[PDB]
RNA sequence: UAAUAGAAUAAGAUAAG
RNA sequence: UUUUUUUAAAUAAUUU
């Protein structure tokens, strides 16, 4: 119920007849989201009244994760709403600071450009002398995740942030080592000397910084294996207790660099069985396919993850119904209950299944005894006849 | 494992090559064919790359550019090769368009005086052989064994240096390991004395060594993910009859004009192994190739 | 104006917040009920974005302790 | 023919060759016993024949369907990637290729999705039949009105039967739908009641039009036309402004005085007008009654690709 | 454009011969031109190599010593698009000519290298 | 549907289109994928490539123009976002836009040539069909990149890599776009040679008929497809046999030991026949010029029995062949005058004047007929030849048509391309024809310039 | 006041210059 | 079955 006061207010909002800012949109859209005693998204032709005055404002004003968010509210009503672009600064507007503001415009806002990174780019090159300690950092962040071609800039900026060891902290100079690794392109001498600069300070890391820079190690590939080994001695003494996400992430990499020192990887494993009922559906299948890897799923290890693993299984996504079907296969083990519940999701889901995907199931099942008196063997006949012009 | 290969320029090929020896160009060209429907028959490849037709005949030796040590793309010295040079570069396009390095490395460039032929090195289970013959200086051994050779408990990789004659072939041509433990080598002089200075520098270690006829060219693809499949040639049997009593199996290929020009199987093929970046603690997945399911049957 | 209106009416959610004031804050809540029926057609067929998005911040706030919806 | 492997999907040249509706807006339609739900009350009916117009009690669209109707009136007004199938349209305001404050579209229906579903919708073209006195109903054509903002002008006093002197009887209706929320200062229709009666069911002298003057005397040149006792009467019952919603339709008489208020709000205001005829309508002379249309002769009964049969009780 | 194993198969050779000796016609008149960028250089100086063109060691000294002012241009100015790889080819045609023709060209080169100035072809 | 990601619906929109297309065109399939797509919109969710490649091409092979919210979100994307379009998704994309006709569209169409012509010499066997396949849908002239593609195909034929079906997409893409290439279709026959059982009959016919487009004038090769589909004559379906004839009507060298299989492999399936197939015979007999009444009184037997299956096309087309060749049918000429009336709207630009004249040509004149070409002939005028124009005159004069209205265009277009409206000599009888009717007073500038 | 990522896959006739 | 590929090119002429 809607008094005379309310009912005037909500009416001048409905028919566009006050000039509204992006500051006073933003904290109508606050209010909303917090409270909603007045039903505000309840209200399409008010909701959709604020849209509009949001699409004729100057969106400049506010940061790019409130336009986002005023963005997001209004895709959960229900209306398609994206913020406008931001242009490119010209003449004296051109600072490290505005050149930073468009990258990170089109991270949060996904709107992705690469004509203007380009440009924003090929402005940034005169000035990068300006550029404060933090501001590299940030824009090579900003870089790294929209998935930049231009390898010799971030190269660049990785000699003028490294230049500044002393000035940096250990998690500026984990960013800066996990961004540089997911670029494609940067010389593998950088990468060399960044990772110089992490094996020292290597006490000072905190289980962020290990994540991290096991991410990074995880991207980087066996030839920096030699670092990964001040990891895992670096960890040997943290080990009892240590994240079960930290804990995943080192078995990983203990599989992706194909260690040798079994002592390690063995200590690691049993530490991270013990806590491996904190993980969620995508460490757990990580970790059960690295322990898979290293030839270390035994009798007990097998059945505490099974028994982890059959949790998820009741809804597990698609991408992880096939993975856990091959470590059921390949090892002398019981595993009929697990295989029972998986084939059941993998029944239920049957329709959204792709054609890759399929195919792996049905490859997995084809020599399982129990799954021919099944009906998935019929129902994935039908998809796969149905499926084949997609194969 | 993707394997790379140049098509002949079917107008430059030389009337007569190396000794004098007379070819014909379109049995080249049906035998490279043939090898190319070959290479892809191989279960372990992944894909079979075709660069484009370049005027020199000296193009179809693509192995030359650059050798796999391990996880490193090492790109040899272009110091006998600068009429190549280009070419070099028209195939690291392709190497980029496959999803492969972005560039090589260039540790043995940078070094003087550091003559490098890939061909003398030889990728041995936990290390590599390298020839001190004419093709390569002490300076190239000593900066291979600086970057690769470590001594550890169980971080070891051993880098062997294997003397040779002058007039020897390079050691890949006649030195090569097969499935996992099989040695594949000539019954020459050459190859003799190759093997019996790797059994001196490698005591107390049980293999077997298969002894195949003079001049028959062979490739095996030796590394992580092990295989059967040894290339031999077609005129020889009796090398095809040794290598199949040694379990393993022989995919004769005609091979007549190539070696007539003096260009072997190994130096006619560029494999590279390629992987994915995995962002984030993720794990990529990798295809089967055993059996599944044996407890139950 | 209208903005005068819904900024001290602003006042009294702050101080209903913080505490409940010398008067008590069943009286604040009355006192924002008298305030915010006060306004007329005059007031805001004039209010500009930011008054408009004060007085619906402040009315939210309110029908939270109110008993009656409003 | 051969219709090419890529092109098997396609439509055609124009909506018009698309026999039935398309499922785009509220998927099929409802099968021939299942027509009865969009019935409206006789009461209804009789303030329509008493009034001269009526306002349906229920929205007739969702808001994502008046969200997409109301984009396909965007793009049927870019002005720089000019709509595709344009040329299928009878009439354009950007013809001039400039526009100006006030887009009017007329055969849209024949141009872009949506609006061509819009005319076979039950629930308007039920109510028409009920309208028409239970008979067939076949589109005479649409029309879309979009007015700027702060700069929309309004369309004086008319009469829509002025314009369709061509069709002899007089059997039509108007539907219009507002695609955006309307009042007075914002594009609301204002109609005079019980002012389809008259002339004896006659037609009004037309108006004067004198453009760039204000909102004030164009609404005011009502007393120009009219007579003393149609003085009077509009004197006892004034014009009246409609309100609508973003989604309400408006039934109004062919003969009922009719005028829409300008636009002061801070955004673009857009409505549909659509005109349904009967059965029994018959045109006058020799020649197409639209330009680029199938031409009669004489007495000839209006049907046709151009003029569909949306609506059929039996 | 010439076969070895065509109809004139035995004619080849002097064709190759005539095409060689006019190519030096233009290759000794190589010192009057200016390089505006290094692909000319590389291009010039590939088909030199791969032909057996025959330069006077004047020639080379003026060619190579053109392309020391660009690379010096690009190392030192860092401001202003010399990839990696054109200048391995260049260091390459340089060592092959010889070293005495620009000895600065060849520590200058050798320390772009190091320093990792030239960008790569993939950026 | 609503739990379905728009990764989901890209997936599910291409198994839709994959079944319309060649499992049976299922307006069941068309209108729920029409409104499945009428409700998606690629905002706020990071999609792939080839996920936004996808939705773009089932949106525009669904009818869906360039003014719809999909197509610009995809476009848009496209645009901003161009390494992301690999060699991969680059022919979705192509293909996706060769219909659609703006200034985005045309942009993105040569920012996608000018990679395909940059990346020509790294592609497969896939993405080189794929690739000029998707570039023959759209009317581009780009030659430097079909050469390219071209030397790429033969670099991958050498070494036979190519089935049956990257044959005929190759030769039919080549082959639209009218690149006469001696040696790339050389090698695409001798690559069909080496495949030899490989190529069935299903993959022969649309080969030959790729090959006899072109236009090549080798008589080398249309010897072999004879002596290669003789064997093939017994198998061959209606829809085959009326390629066969049209190839070989195309290819102009008699081959009677053929064409008499061929007319009696056509007499056995004459129940089978629809227009379109008549139409096609009877046409490819007009080309090469063979005059086989017995052949021809089963074809129009068979015709005056699917005479409302006739399209404009068809009715233009069997109008021109039996006028051609001489043969009255009045039943079948009336029947297939007052359908022509019924559709007169259908006619392109080439049917109507090749219908009219057709008409006019045989003494059979119909009011039905001649008023309905007559009025249609308005829209199509400003798309003729001055040969077509003067076709078009002279058959509206045996209709003895005088309307202004009709009359103005045509004399304006032949007014317009005056010089070649009477540099034609072989029209020079239909000339003294036209003025004979009209005579000086209509139009008198065109009579002063036929005087000259 | 607000930032976490996974998939690798090919349909095929326009009345020409 | 053996044809051919690799520039930054910028010099027309006009009352349209």
């Known amino acids: ?391 | ?297 | ?70 | 023919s051969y219709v090419l492997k890529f092109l098997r999907g396609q439509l055609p040249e124009d909506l018009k060759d698309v026999n039935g509706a398309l499922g785009c807006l509220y998927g099929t339609l409802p099968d021939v016993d299942e027509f009865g739900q969009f019935v409206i009350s006789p009461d209804v009916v009789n303030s329509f024949h008493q009034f001269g117009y009526v306002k349906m009690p229920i929205p007739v669209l969702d808001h994502q369907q008046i969200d997409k109707l109301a984009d396909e009136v965007n793009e049927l007004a870019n002005n720089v990637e000019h709509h595709p199938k344009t040329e299928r349209l009878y009439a354009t305001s950007l013809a001039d290729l400039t526009g100006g404050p006030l887009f009017f579209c007329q055969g849209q229906w024949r141009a872009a999705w949506g609006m061509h579903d819009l005319i076979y919708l039950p629930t308007i073209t039920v109510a028409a039949s009920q309208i028409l006195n239970n008979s067939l109903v076949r589109l005479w054509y649409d029309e879309v009105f979009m007015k700027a903002a702060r700069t929309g002008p309004c369309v004086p006093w008319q009469q829509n039967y002025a314009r369709w002197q061509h069709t002899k009887p007089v059997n039509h209706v108007t539907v219009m739908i507002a695609l955006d929320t309307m009042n007075k200062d914002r594009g609301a229709p204002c109609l005079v009641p019980g002012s389809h009666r008259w002339r004896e069911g006659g037609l009004l002298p037309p108006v004067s039009y004198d453009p760039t003057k204000d909102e004030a005397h164009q609404l005011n040149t009502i007393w120009e036309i009219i007579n003393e006792e149609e003085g009077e009467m509009l004197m006892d019952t004034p014009p009246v402004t409609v309100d609508l919603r973003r989604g309400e339709a408006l039934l109004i008489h062919p003969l009922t005085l009719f005028a829409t208020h300008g636009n002061r709000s801070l955004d673009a205001v857009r409505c549909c007008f659509i005109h349904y005829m009967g059965e029994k309508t018959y045109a006058v002379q020799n020649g197409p009654l639209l330009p680029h249309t199938t031409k009669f002769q004489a007495d000839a009964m209006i049907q046709g690709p151009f003029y569909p049969v949306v609506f059929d009780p039996a | ?123 | ?452």
């Not at chain 2, 690291?92 to 492969?100: L, N």
């Not at chain 6, 893409?173 to 695409?188: E, T, V, W």
């Not at chain 6, 009959?201 to 080798?218: R, W």
């Not at chain 6, 086989?292 to 062949?321: G, W, Y």
Request: with cysteine; hydrophobic share 40%.
């Open chain 1, 1 to 391: 119920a809607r008094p005379s006061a309310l009912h005037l207010i909500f009416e001048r909002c409905k028919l566009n007849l006050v000039e509204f800012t992006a500051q006073d949109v933003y904290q109508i859209c606050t209010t909303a989201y917090n409270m909603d005693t007045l039903g505000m998204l309840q209200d399409p032709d008010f909701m959709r009244g604020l849209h509009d005055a949001f699409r004729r404002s100057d969106q400049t004003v506010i940061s790019p994760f409130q336009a986002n968010l005023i963005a997001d509210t209004f895709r959960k009503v229900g209306i398609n709403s994206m913020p406008k672009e931001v242009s490119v600064p010209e003449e004296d507007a051109i600072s490290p600071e505005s050149l930073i503001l468009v990258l990170r415009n089109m991270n949060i806002t996904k709107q992705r450009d690469e004509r203007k990174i380009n440009e924003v780019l090929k402005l940034m090159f005169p000035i990068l002398d300006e550029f404060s300690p933090t501001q590299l950092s940030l824009t090579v962040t900003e870089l790294a995740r929209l998935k930049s071609t231009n390898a010799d800039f971030v190269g660049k900026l990785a000699k003028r942030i490294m230049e500044y060891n002393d000035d940096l902290s250990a998690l500026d100079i984990s960013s800066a080592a996990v961004s540089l690794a997911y670029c494609p392109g940067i010389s593998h001498n950088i990468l060399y000397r960044m990772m110089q600069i992490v094996e020292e300070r290597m006490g000072e890391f905190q289980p962020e910084d290990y994540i991290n820079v096991l991410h990074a190690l995880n991207t980087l590939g066996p030839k920096f294996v030699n670092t990964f080994r001040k990891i895992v001695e670096c960890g040997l003494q943290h080990v009892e207790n240590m994240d079960a996400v930290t804990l995943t992430n080192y078995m990983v990499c203990f599989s992706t660099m194909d260690y040798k020192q079994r002592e390690h990887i063995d200590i690691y494993a049993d530490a991270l069985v013990e806590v491996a009922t904190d993980l969620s559906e995508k460490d757990l299948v990580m970790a059960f396919i690295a322990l898979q890897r290293l030839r270390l799923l035994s009798d007990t290890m097998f059945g505490t993850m099974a028994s982890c693993v059959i949790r998820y299984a009741a809804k597990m996504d698609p991408r992880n119904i096939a993975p856990i079907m091959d470590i059921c296969s390949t090892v002398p083990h019981a595993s009929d209950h697990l295989m029972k519940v998986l084939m059941d999701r993998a029944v239920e889901c049957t329709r959204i299944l792709t054609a890759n995907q399929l195919g792996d199931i049905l490859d997995i099942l084809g020599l399982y005894p129990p799954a021919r008196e099944h009906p998935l063997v019929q129902l994935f006949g039908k998809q796969a006849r149905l499926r084949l012009d997609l194969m």
């Open chain 6, 1 to 452: 549907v609503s739990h379905l990601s728009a990764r989901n619906i890209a997936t599910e929109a291409l198994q839709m289109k994959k079944l319309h297309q060649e499992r049976g065109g299922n307006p069941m399939l068309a209108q729920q994928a029409r409104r499945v797509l009428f409700a998606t919109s690629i905002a706020g969710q990071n999609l792939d490539a080839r996920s936004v490649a996808l939705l773009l091409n089932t949106a525009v092979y669904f009818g869906m123009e360039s003014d719809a919210k999909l197509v610009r979100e995809c476009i848009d994307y496209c645009l901003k976002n161009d390494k992301l379009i690999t060699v991969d998704v680059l022919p979705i994309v192509v293909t996706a836009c060769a219909t659609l006709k703006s200034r985005d569209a045309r942009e993105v169409i040569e920012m996608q040539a000018q990679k395909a012509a940059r990346n020509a010499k790294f592609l497969d066997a896939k993405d080189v069909t794929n690739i000029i396949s998707a570039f023959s849908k759209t009317g581009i002239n780009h030659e430097k990149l079909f050469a390219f593609l071209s030397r790429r195909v033969q670099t991958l034929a050498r070494v036979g890599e190519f089935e049956a079906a990257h044959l005929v997409i190759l030769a039919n893409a080549f082959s639209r776009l009218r690149y006469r290439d001696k040696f790339l279709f050389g090698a695409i026959a001798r690559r069909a040679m080496s495949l030899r059982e490989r190529v069935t009959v299903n993959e022969l016919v649309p080969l030959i008929v790729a090959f006899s487009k072109i236009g090549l004038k080798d008589p080398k090769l249309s010897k072999r497809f004879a002596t290669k589909a003789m064997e093939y004559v017994d198998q061959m379906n209606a829809e085959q046999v009326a390629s066969m004839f049209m190839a070989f009507a195309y290819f102009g060298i008699r081959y009677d030991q053929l064409f008499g299989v061929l007319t009696n492999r056509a007499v056995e399936l004459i129940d089978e026949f629809n227009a379109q197939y008549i139409s096609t015979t009877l046409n490819a007999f007009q080309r090469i010029g063979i005059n086989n009444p017995e052949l021809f009184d089963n074809l129009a037997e068979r015709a005056l029995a699917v005479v409302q299956d006739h399209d404009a096309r068809d009715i233009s087309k069997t109008v021109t062949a039996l006028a051609h060749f001489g043969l009255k049918d009045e039943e079948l000429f009336k029947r297939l005058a007052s359908h022509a009336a019924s559709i007169a709207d259908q006619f392109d630009a080439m049917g109507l004047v090749n219908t009219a004249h057709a008409f006019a040509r045989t003494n059979f004149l119909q009011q039905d007929m001649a008023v309905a070409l007559s009025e249609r002939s308005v829209y199509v005028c400003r798309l003729l030849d001055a040969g077509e124009t003067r076709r078009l005159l002279w058959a509206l004069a045996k209709f003895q048509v005088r309307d202004p209205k009709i009359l103005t265009p045509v004399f304006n277009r032949c007014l317009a391309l005056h010089y070649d409206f009477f540099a034609d000599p072989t029209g020079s009888e239909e000339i003294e024809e036209i003025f004979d009717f009209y005579g000086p007073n209509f139009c008198p500038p065109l009579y002063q310039l036929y005087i000259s």
């Open chain 3, 1 to 70: 104006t209208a903005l005068d209106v819904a900024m001290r009416v602003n006042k009294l959610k702050r101080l209903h917040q913080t505490g409940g004031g010398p008067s008590g804050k069943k009286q604040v809540e009355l006192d924002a009920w008298r305030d915010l029926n006060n306004l007329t057609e005059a007031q805001i067929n004039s209010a500009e974005g930011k008054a408009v998005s004060l007085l619906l911040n402040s009315w939210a706030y309110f029908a939270k302790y109110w008993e009656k919806g409003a």
């Open chain 5, 1 to 123: 454009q010439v076969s070895d194993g065509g109809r004139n198969a035995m004619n080849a050779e002097p064709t190759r011969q005539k095409l060689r000796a006019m190519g030096e016609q233009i290759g000794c008149r190589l010192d009057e031109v200016e390089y505006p960028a290094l692909p000319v250089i590389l291009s010039i100086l590939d088909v030199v190599v791969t032909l057996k063109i025959y330069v006077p060691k004047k020639c080379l000294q003026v060619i190579f010593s053109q392309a020391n002012d660009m690379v010096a241009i690009v190392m030192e100015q860092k401001d202003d698009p010399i990839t990696a790889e054109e200048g391995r080819q260049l260091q390459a045609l340089l060592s092959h000519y010889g070293n005495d023709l620009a000895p600065e060209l060849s520590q200058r080169m050798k320390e772009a290298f190091r320093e990792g100035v030239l960008p790569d072809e993939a950026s």
């Open chain 2, 1 to 297: 494992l993707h394997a790379f290969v140049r098509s002949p320029h079917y107008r430059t090929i030389p009337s007569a090559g190396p000794n004098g020896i007379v070819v014909n160009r379109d049995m080249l060209v049906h035998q490279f064919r043939d090898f190319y429907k070959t290479l892809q028959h191989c279960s372990l490849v992944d894909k079979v790359h075709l660069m484009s037709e370049r005027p020199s005949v000296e193009a179809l030796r693509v192995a030359d550019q650059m050798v796999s040590i391990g996880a490193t793309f090492l790109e040899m010295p272009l110091t006998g090769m600068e009429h190549r040079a280009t070419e070099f570069m028209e195939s690291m396009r392709y190497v980029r368009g496959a999803g492969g390095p972005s560039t090589l490395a260039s540790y043995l460039q940078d070094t003087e005086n550091c003559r490098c032929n890939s061909g003398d090195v030889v990728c041995l289970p936990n290390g590599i052989a390298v020839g001190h013959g004419p093709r390569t200086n002490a300076v190239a051994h000593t900066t291979l064994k600086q970057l690769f050779e470590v001594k550890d408990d169980q971080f070891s990789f051993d880098v062997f240096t294997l003397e040779q004659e002058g007039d020897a072939p390079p050691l890949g041509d006649y030195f090569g390991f097969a499935g996992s433990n099989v040695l594949l080598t000539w019954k020459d002089e050459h190859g003799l004395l190759a093997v019996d200075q790797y059994q001196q520098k490698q005591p107390h270690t049980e293999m077997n060594v298969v002894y195949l006829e003079p001049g028959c060219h062979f490739l095996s693809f030796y590394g992580v993910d092990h295989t059967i499949d040894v290339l031999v040639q077609k005129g020889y049997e009796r090398s095809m009859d040794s290598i199949a009593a040694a379990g393993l199996n022989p995919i004769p290929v005609q091979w007549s004009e190539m070696d007539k020009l003096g260009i072997s199987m190994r130096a006619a093929v560029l494999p590279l192994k390629f992987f994915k970046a995995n962002v984030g603690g993720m794990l990529s997945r990798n295809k089967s190739r055993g059996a599944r399911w044996q407890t139950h049957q």
